Amino acid sequence: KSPSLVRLKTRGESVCPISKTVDSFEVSVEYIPRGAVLAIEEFKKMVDSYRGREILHEELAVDLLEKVKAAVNPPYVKVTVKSYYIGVEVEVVAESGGVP
Amino acid sequence: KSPSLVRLKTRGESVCPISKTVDSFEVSVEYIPRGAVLAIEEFKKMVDSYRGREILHEELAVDLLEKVKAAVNPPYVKVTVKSYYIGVEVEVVAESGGVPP
Amino acid sequence: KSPSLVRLKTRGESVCPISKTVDSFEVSVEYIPRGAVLAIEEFKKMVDSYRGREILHEELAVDLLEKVKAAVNPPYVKVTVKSYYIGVEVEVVAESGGV
Amino acid sequence: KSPSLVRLKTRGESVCPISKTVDSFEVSVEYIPRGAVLAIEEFKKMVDSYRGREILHEELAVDLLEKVKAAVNPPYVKVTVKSYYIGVEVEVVAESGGVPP
Amino acid sequence: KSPSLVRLKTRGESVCPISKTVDSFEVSVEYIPRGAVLAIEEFKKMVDSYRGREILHEELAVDLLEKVKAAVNPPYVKVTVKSYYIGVEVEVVAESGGVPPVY
Amino acid sequence: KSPSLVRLKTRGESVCPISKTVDSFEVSVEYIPRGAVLAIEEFKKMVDSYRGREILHEELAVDLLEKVKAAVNPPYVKVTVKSYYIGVEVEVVAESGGVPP
Amino acid sequence: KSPSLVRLKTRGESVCPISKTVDSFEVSVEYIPRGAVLAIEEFKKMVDSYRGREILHEELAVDLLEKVKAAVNPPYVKVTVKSYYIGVEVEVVAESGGVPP
Amino acid sequence: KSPSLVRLKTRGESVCPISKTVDSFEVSVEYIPRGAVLAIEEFKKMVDSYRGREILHEELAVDLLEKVKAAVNPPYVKVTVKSYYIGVEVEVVAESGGVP
Amino acid sequence: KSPSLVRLKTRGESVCPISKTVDSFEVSVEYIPRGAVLAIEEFKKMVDSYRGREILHEELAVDLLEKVKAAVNPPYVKVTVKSYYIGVEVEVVAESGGVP
Amino acid sequence: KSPSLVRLKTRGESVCPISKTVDSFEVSVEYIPRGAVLAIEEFKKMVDSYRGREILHEELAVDLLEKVKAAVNPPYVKVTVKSYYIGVEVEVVAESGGVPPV
């Protein structure tokens, strides 16, 4: 019997395409396992893969959502990325398997 | 796929019509993207547009809502304006489209 | 175009009808405007009208909801009064409708 | 007219039947009045009645629920007792009814 | 007549199989009694049983669920194990049953 | 025997002399008693005395300090008025000393 | 040897001599042991002695300081009582001996 | 008889001279009035003067301290600027006068 | 060079001699190293040594102070035990090498 | 004129030489400038330098102190490293200099 839910939360970094400087973030994933739990090692790998990558955080959220789906194919996955830029607090959510 | 939700939060200022003096506020916008995400620089410009402008926090929330719809036309947007006035904590909310939670 | 929801929160005072002592509270009002937003100055007046009034907080929440309904007639109001009495934290909520 | 909802929260104590030792707790009650508001005085008596009584918090919660139901017969009541024992944070909830019946 | 819901929360530890080091956790259990309440003392022994045991937290949450179901056969139980590994905050949940819909 | 220190904190209001609107504040008072503790009722009256009065919070802090001194003559008093004006958090402190036994 | 410092904190109640109603408080005790530590049971008895007693919190703080001094004679003790009365937060401090640096 | 200490806190903005992008900050000032209390309007104008100015936050703090000294000459002033850049929380303090 | 200061904090438990029951606590140690830094594993072992031991939290603090002194001999050590007992929050401090 | 004090705080990571596993940390540096301010970009690279490095957090604090002193020789520096390991909250402080007393 697998867990019914896993939540993962960690910090990461990427390169902001506009400024071209390092943009730190906090990322959260929540998923319902379907016969496979994502190794913590592998998740960190996915998050650290964005270091030095020019990518906007909106596309980071969706990209990581796609990675988790390709790795363990859960019926429900939510990814939230939180960061700060030019005095604004920003959160972007990507979600697959929620309401239609 | 687009993100399913974006939340933005920042501080701004306007001129209060009743007191005739500068009033601080905190503003949050939550929206369901459809196509492009609102650039943060653009959001900051919208909020900054109210500096020096005499406008009630009720009307500012509604105005900002219409500015976000004009720019990125999301199916759902909610704007919340929080401020402190004469010892009263005030939140004003302006919302267009269907409930997300 | 009215906003779709307003939240107001502030401190006030009443008089405890048993001891005749000042009884401090925090009050939160939440309403859906229908074409009229209650002016903050008017809200403060309503809350301040309870100074010197002997009234239990259970009745004040109901009384205040009535003042708001009569002033701006919203379709949904909720009034929450919080206070602390004989070592009990009390919240009293008075409503009218869904959300 | 009655309030639509009341919440009450206070501290109390009982005696742990294992060690015969004082067993402090926090208790919260929420209920929907139906024609009758429980006096705060009377709630505090109900809570203080457990002082020096040997009773498990699992039983106290249910006992207090019954007491509130007997005093004001609300359509909904929920009693929560929170305490600390052998390094374990415990909450016991006892709940009755709902809206509608 | 028993409670409607009990929530228990405490700290524990196991041994991480990959690094052979102590893997500290917080565990939360919530359940609906059906004519048996889980004694707190029995709960704390279940949780302490993992001290020195090599077991992934994903397995631990499920194992502890199975322990609680076996002790009191409740119609609903949820176990949540929170730990911190390689800079990642982890929460693993195991569930069984629930309240059928308040019709 | 009297306490070594008392701290009091409450909310009040005054009138901003420029705008003539309500200027809400939080006020904290610390004092070392000299044989005599200020009644709370009397402190509340002092604070409530600024209601409707046009005065700057600078001045208020000092005025209240003087009222406390005139009433129970402590060898040490400190008054702190905190308010929020044109998006600036402001704290004004006034303090006064003397000799003990 | 003894500890260098103990701090204790708990809630109590007394009866307000003006309103005659139960008057809740928080009390902290800090002291430097000299050869003996106050048993927690003993402390809780002291704090519970005020239940049902008409006493001002300012008098209570000093009274509890004396009880502590009588029980275990520490070279430094400080007692702080915090309560809420007519919209004012009150802290009363009673202190005895040379103060920590 | 005037105040023994004033504490002011607010938000502002400057322009980062490397990135040329908006560099948002919180500023705290405390000072001992001697004679003169700084008008809040006037303090606010000091802080707002940095908006659209290319100035590093270490310079700004010092610049603002001199402004408060030039306006009201207190025997003690302390200015703290807090900001966030590339994932680092930064506080710059510029302090003058005071007995020990 | 050694660090100038170390703080450790963790949870543990003992057995209350009054009630006979397990008594949980939080413990903090602060020391100035002189040569030796206490291995965290070793600290954990000292705090875990109190499990199933009948001891008052007052004595516990002093006992752990003497263990740390015995292990790494710092010129300054402070131990603080915090617990909750019969509705009373309790903090006990033991200190070695401050002003006497 | 230089600032009187600068505080920097960020998150980093290293590898525990005992367990061989990544440990996350928060690090704060506080210093008094003497006519050189450490550019932020430089501080960030000092902290990033520990990623994958097998080093005890005790040694990290002292090693980072020494990097700040070498780079800008301030008359006071304090480095604090905070982390969590086997259920223990740890803070290591490395400190050099100060304000010379009157």
Our answer to whether residue H16 is catalytic in this structure is: yes
The Cα G98–Cα D17 span in angstroms is: 44
**Token output for A88:** 């604004």
Instruction: Enumerate the residues of chain I whose CB falls inside 8 A of the CB of residue D10.
Output: none
Residue A74 CA: distances (Å) to CA of A29, A70, E79, I59: 12, 9, 20, 53
DSSP secondary structure code for residue F2 in this structure: -
What is the least distance, in Å, from the CA of J21 to any CA of chain H? 23
Three-state SS for chain H is CCCCEEEEEEEEEEECCCCCCEEEEEEEEEECCCCCCCCHHHHHHHHHCCCCCECCHHHHHHHHHHHHHHHHCCCEEEEEEEEEECCEEEEEEEEEECCC
Q: Is D54 annotated as a binding residue?
A: no
DSSP secondary structure code for residue G100 in this structure: P
Of B11, B22, B44, the CB nearest to H11: B11
Resolution, angstroms, 1 dp = 1.9
CA nearest H1: which of H35, H38, H40?
H35
CB distance F44–G95 less than 8 Å?
no
What is the rounded end-to-end Cα distance, in angstroms, of chain I? 28
The Cα B58–Cα C1 span in angstroms is: 9
Burial-class residue D50 by CB neighbours within 10 Å (0-12, 13-18, 19+). buried
Instruction: Enumerate the residues of chain D whose CB falls inside 8 A of the CB of residue G44.
Output: 22
The Cα G3–Cα I81 span in angstroms is: 10
Q: Is C40 annotated as a binding residue?
A: yes
CB distance E19–J24 less than 8 Å?
no
CB distance B89–C43 less than 8 Å?
no
The Cα F34–Cα F31 span in angstroms is: 9
* Interchain touch J–D (≥3 Cβ pairs closer than 8 Å): no
Of J62, J86, J93, the CB nearest to I41: J86
Interface of J with I (CB under 8 A): 18, 56, 58, 61-62, 78, 85-95
The Cα C76–Cα C4 span in angstroms is: 11
Which one of A23, A47, A74, A79 is the catalytic residue? A23
CB distance I21–D24 less than 8 Å?
no
Residue with tokens 């700060």: A84
**Residues of J31-56 as b/e, b for ≥16 C-beta within 10 angstroms?**
bbbeeebbebeebbebbebbeeeebb
CB neighbour list of residue J42: distance below 8 Å, 6 or more residues apart: J71
The Cα C57–Cα C63 span in angstroms is: 9
Ramachandran angles phi, psi of F100, nearest 5°: -75, -165
Residue with tokens 């259990």: E29
Contact I24, I47 (CB under 8 A): no
What is the least distance, in Å, from the CA of H24 to any CA of chain A? 5
CB neighbour list of residue C3: distance below 8 Å, 6 or more residues apart: B58, B61, B62, B92, B93, B94, C33, C37
The β-bridge relationship of strands B5-15 and J22-31 is unpaired
G97: left (phi over 0), alpha (psi -120 to 50) or beta: left
Ramachandran angles phi, psi of A82, nearest 5°: -120, 130
CA nearest D84: which of D31, D42, D23, D17?
D23
Residue I24 CA: distances (Å) to CA of D81, E45, H17, H27, I90: 20, 15, 54, 43, 12
What is the least distance, in Å, from the CA of D87 to any CA of chain C? 26
Instruction: Enumerate the residues of chain H whose CB falls inside 8 A of the CB of residue F88.
Output: 8-10, 40, 43-44
Instruction: Enumerate the residues of chain I whose CB falls inside 8 A of the CB of residue J93.
Output: 3-7
Of B24, B84, B86, the CB nearest to F21: B86
CB distance I92–G5 less than 8 Å?
yes
Contact D101, D75 (CB under 8 A): yes
Dihedral (Cα; C29, C30, C34, C40), 10-degree rounding: 40
Interface of C with G (CB under 8 A): 11, 13, 16, 18-19, 21-22, 24, 84, 86-87
Of A4, A5, A43, the CB nearest to E88: A43
Our answer to whether residue B63 is catalytic in this structure is: no
What is the least distance, in Å, from the CA of I62 to any CA of chain D? 22
Q: How many CB pairs under 8 A join C and G?
A: 28
Residue with tokens 């990427």: A14
CB distance H22–A86 less than 8 Å?
yes
CB distance J58–I4 less than 8 Å?
no
Contact B97, B75 (CB under 8 A): yes
Probe site for chain B from F11, F21, F83 (most B CB atoms < 10 A): F21
Q: Is J23 annotated as a binding residue?
A: yes
DSSP secondary structure code for residue E65 in this structure: H
The Cα D14–Cα D16 span in angstroms is: 7
CA nearest I65: which of I77, I53, I51?
I77
Contact E68, E39 (CB under 8 A): no
CB distance E90–A6 less than 8 Å?
yes
Residue with tokens 């067993």: D23
Q: Is J32 annotated as a binding residue?
A: no
Contact G26, G13 (CB under 8 A): no
Q: Is H63 annotated as a binding residue?
A: no
Q: Is G58 annotated as a binding residue?
A: yes
What is the least distance, in Å, from the CA of D84 to any CA of chain I? 9
**Token output for D23:** 């067993």
Secondary structure tally for chain D: helices H, strands E: 2, 4
Amino acid at H63: D
The Cα E82–Cα E65 span in angstroms is: 15
Contact B68, B74 (CB under 8 A): yes
Interface of G with I (CB under 8 A): 1-11, 37, 40-41, 43-44, 101
The Cα G30–Cα G50 span in angstroms is: 19
The β-bridge relationship of strands F88-96 and G5-15 is unpaired
> Where along chain B do its domains lie?
1-101
The Cα H73–Cα H67 span in angstroms is: 9
* Interchain touch A–J (≥3 Cβ pairs closer than 8 Å): yes
Instruction: Enumerate the residues of chain A whose CB falls inside 8 A of the CB of residue H13.
Output: 87
